[PDB]
Amino acid sequence: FKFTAQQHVYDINGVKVGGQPGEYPTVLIGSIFYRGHKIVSDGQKGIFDKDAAKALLDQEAELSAETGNPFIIDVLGESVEALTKYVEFILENTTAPFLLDSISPDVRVGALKNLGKDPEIQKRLIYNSIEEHYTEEELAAIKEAGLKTAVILAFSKKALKPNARIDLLQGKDDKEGLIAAAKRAGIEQFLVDPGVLDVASNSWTTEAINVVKEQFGYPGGCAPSAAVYLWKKMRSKGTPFFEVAGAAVFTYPITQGADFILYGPMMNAPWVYRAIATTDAMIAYNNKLTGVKMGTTEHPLLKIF
Amino acid sequence: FKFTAQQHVYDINGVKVGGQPGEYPTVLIGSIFYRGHKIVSDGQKGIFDKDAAKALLDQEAELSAETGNPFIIDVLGESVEALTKYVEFILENTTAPFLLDSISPDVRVGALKNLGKDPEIQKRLIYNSIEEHYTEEELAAIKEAGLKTAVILAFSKKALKPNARIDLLQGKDDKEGLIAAAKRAGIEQFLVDPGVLDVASNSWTTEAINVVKEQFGYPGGCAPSAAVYLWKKMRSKGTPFFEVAGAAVFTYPITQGADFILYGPMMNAPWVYRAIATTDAMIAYNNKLTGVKMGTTEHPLLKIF
C-alpha cells in the first residue's frame, strides 16, 4: 500500500523520519531518566549515574549501527533543575536528536528558559509535546528557544475516532488546530503522535497515523510503552513472554506504515531493535513489488541477514 | 484491513478458521515429531515419549484456554510406520484437528491408507499438503479417505512473486492449479499457505495471502519457522532476541489479515501464544472501524488483559 499525500521526510541533525512505507527504517525513541529509573537517585536535583547513562547511549549507537534504525532519545525530567542537567549531559554524550519530555509543562518551559536559543537546541531538541491543553506561555517558551521540530500529541480524550485527528490538527469551529498553534511558536516540522490509551487501542492509534500520512503526509508514530508496562499479567511472566508481547505492540504500528516508535525504557533497546528491524526488513522487501525505492542503504533489509 | 471477497469460515471439529480480520482469533498450529524432536527415540518406527507428547498437548490446551487462540496439531513423520502411530496417538490424546504432514508424499499417502475410512479422520485430519508435485494416486488416496479439508501449499521456487503463487493455486495455461486438483480429490475446504522462501519474503507470502482472501475468500496462513531457524545471524544472539525476531515474523501476516500460523515446534507455544494473542486483541479492537463483528467471545481481546 501507498499514501496519496507526498510524505514529509524531515532531516533532524542527520536522522531521517517519515516517507512512504519501506522508504526509511523506523526511528526508535528510548526513554531515559523516566519516573523510577534506577540510574536516578534524586529526580528533583537530577543526581544520575553518568557512567550508566553513557553506557545506555553507547548501546543505542551500537544497536543503531547494527540494524540501521536511527535513534532519538526521550529525555524525561520531574523538575526544571533535573531536566536541564539531563539535557546538558545528552548534548555532550551523544550526537542524537532528543525529546524534551515531562509530565508537567512547567518543567519543559523552565528547562527551555535555562537552555536558551542555542543553535544546537534548535537542531537537536524536539518539543514533546504540543497537546490539546497547550498554553500561551508554553508557545512563548518554544518560540524564545527558537525550536523548529515538535511532537504533536494529536489526542483528545473526547475524540477517540481516527478521523477526528483531521479536526485536532487543522482546527474546527472556534478551536485553533494543533498545527496552527505549533506554527505560531515557530515550529516548521510536525511529528504526529495520535496517543495510546491501552494496548488494544494501539490499532486506533495506527489507523489515526494512516489518516495523517494519507491526507497531510506528516511523519506518524506513537508511544505504547506505558500501556505495555500497565499490563501486569504480561510483565510478571518474565523472559521471553514480556519481550515478545512488547515486540507485538511496538511492531504493529510499523506494519501499517508508521515512521517512529517511543519504545519506553532504553534498557529494552536490545530486544526492541531486533524485533523492529525484522518488521522493517519484511516491509522494505515488499518495495520489490511496489517499485517504492529505499531512501538510504542504512536499512535493516540490507544489514540484519 | 477488510477483504473484498465474502470470506469462507470453516468449522473443523469445533475450530473456526478464516473470516474478516478481527472476526475469529488466529488458529495456531504447533509441530510435533518433527526432524530432531528429542522426545522421539526412533523416527523410523515412531517410538516416542508418550508422557512428554501428552505434556506438549496439555500445554497447548492450557495456552489455548488462556488466550482463546484455537490449535490444530502439525503431526510430522519420516515413515508410514511412524506417521500412522503419531496420528493414532493424537486421535486418542487430544480433541484437536491435526495436519497429516510429511516432506515425502509416499509417507503421507501410505499413512492415510492405514487409517482407512473413519468419520473421526474425515472431521479432524487436514491433508498437508496439495502441492505442485501432486499425483493422481495421492488425489485418489485422499478421495478414498473421504477428507474434506487440505492445506494448499503454493511454495514453489518456480513461483516466487505472489501473483505466480496465485497462478499455481487457480491454474494457468496447461495447469488446472492446486485448488482444482484438491476439488478432484473431494476437498471442499482450502487452508491456503503460499509458502515462506525466507524471512524477508514473508511480506510476499503475506501479499499472496491478501490476494487469496481478496479474490477467493479461502483462509490464508503460512509456516515461517524453518526460515527463522535458518536465520544464523539472529538465532546466534539467543534469548530473547531470537524469540522477539520470531514473534515479529509470526505476527506480521496476522497484522495484514491472515487466519492461521504454523509457528514451528510446539515447545515454542508459550511465547508464540503471548505474541499472536497480543496482535489479535489489537486487530479485534479495529472491528467497529472495519464494520466486522466477532464470531466468538473466546477472543484474546476479551481474555488476555
Author numbering:
A (entry chain A), B (entry chain B): 2 to 306
The authors write:
During energy production in Desulfitobacterium hafniense, MtgA catalyzes the methyl transfer from methylcobalamin (Cbl‐CH3) to THF in the catabolism of glycine betaine (GB). Despite its lack of sequence identity with known structures, we could show that MtgA forms a homodimeric complex of two TIM barrels. The topology of each subunit is characterized by a funnel of eight parallel β‐sheets connected by α‐helices on the outside that form a complex of two perpendicularly oriented TIM barrels. The active‐site cavity is located inside the hydrophilic core of each barrel.
Apart from snapshots of individual reaction steps of MtgA, structure‐based mutagenesis combined with enzymatic activity assays allowed a mechanistic description of the methyl transfer between Cbl‐CH3 and THF.
